[PDB]
Amino acid sequence: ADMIVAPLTINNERAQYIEFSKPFKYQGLTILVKK
Amino acid sequence: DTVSGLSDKKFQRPQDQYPPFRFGTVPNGSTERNIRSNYRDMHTHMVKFNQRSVEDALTSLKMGKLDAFIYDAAVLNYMAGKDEGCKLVTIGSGKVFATTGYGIAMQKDSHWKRAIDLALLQFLGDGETQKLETVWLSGIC
Numbered sequence: 001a002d003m004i005v006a007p008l009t010i011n012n013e014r015a016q017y018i019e020f021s022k023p024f025k026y027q028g029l030t031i032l033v034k035k
Numbered sequence: 036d037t038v039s040g041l042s043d044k045k046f047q048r049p050q051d052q053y054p055p056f057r058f059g060t061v062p063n064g065s066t067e068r069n070i071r072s073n074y075r076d077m078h079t080h081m082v083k084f085n086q087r088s089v090e091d092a093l094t095s096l097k098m099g100k101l102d103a104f105i106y107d108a109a110v111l112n113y114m115a116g117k118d119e120g121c122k123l124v125t126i127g128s129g130k131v132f133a134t135t136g137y138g139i140a141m142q143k144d145s146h147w148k149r150a151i152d153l154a155l156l157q158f159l160g161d162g163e164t165q166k167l168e169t170v171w172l173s174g175i176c
């Protein structure tokens with residue numbers, strides 16, 4: 001592959017071997033509960 | 036709320052009999068560039084600005100000089116969070132227009148960017164930015 005166009009999360013483990021781009025959408029982490 | 040953001044005809048069309056006027060937009064900073072680049076009609080109408088920072092603008096608003104303030108997100112949120120009683124911003128989850136972020140500016144293509152950036156990613160990774168948020172940026176309301 002030559003590019004990844006997908007919801008890829010930016011973190012320390014990937015930045016050592018990849019040159020990322022500026023984020024295009026900010027997000028966090030939640031949990032799912034049935035209601 | 037009274038205004039639906041930058042798409043409301045009140046802002047978009049400054050020709051009302053009751054002309055909701057003079058959002059702060061301290062001149063010759065950053066958001067003024069966005070306003071003057073995208074839609075020139077506010078920038079033409081918008082001349083009753085503030086000559087000082089948010090500190091003077093908030094008291095001017097409280098005194099009734101102007102009824103709307105347009106500025107950054109973090110600083111305005113902090114100002115609203117630290118106040119006697121409360122002055123309410125528009126709907127906060129939707130009050131972040133033209134989303135961006137702070138950062139460090141260096142010289143063009145310097146070798147520090149490789150290390151300081153990864154340090155920042157680490158910092159956001161271990162949660163050490165979080166208790167800084169608790170310590171330095173908090174309010175009662």
Ligand SMILES: *[C@@H]1O[C@H](CO)[C@@H](O[C@@H]2O[C@H](CO)[C@@H](O[C@@H]3O[C@H](CO)[C@@H](O)[C@H](O)[C@@H]3O)[C@H](O)[C@H]2NC(C)=O)[C@H](O)[C@H]1NC(C)=O
Binds near residue numbers: 061063064
């Ligand atoms: C935005 O850019 C301006 C550009 O200089 C910054 O300075 C303001 O610009 C006006 C217009 O050029 C300047 O007026 C000057 O005033 C002095 C003293 O009255 C006069 O002798 C000069 O001939 C000239 O007319 C002035 O430097 C300044 N405006 C005022 C009222 O002092 C300005 O700092 C930048 N940022 C902001 C937030 O405005």
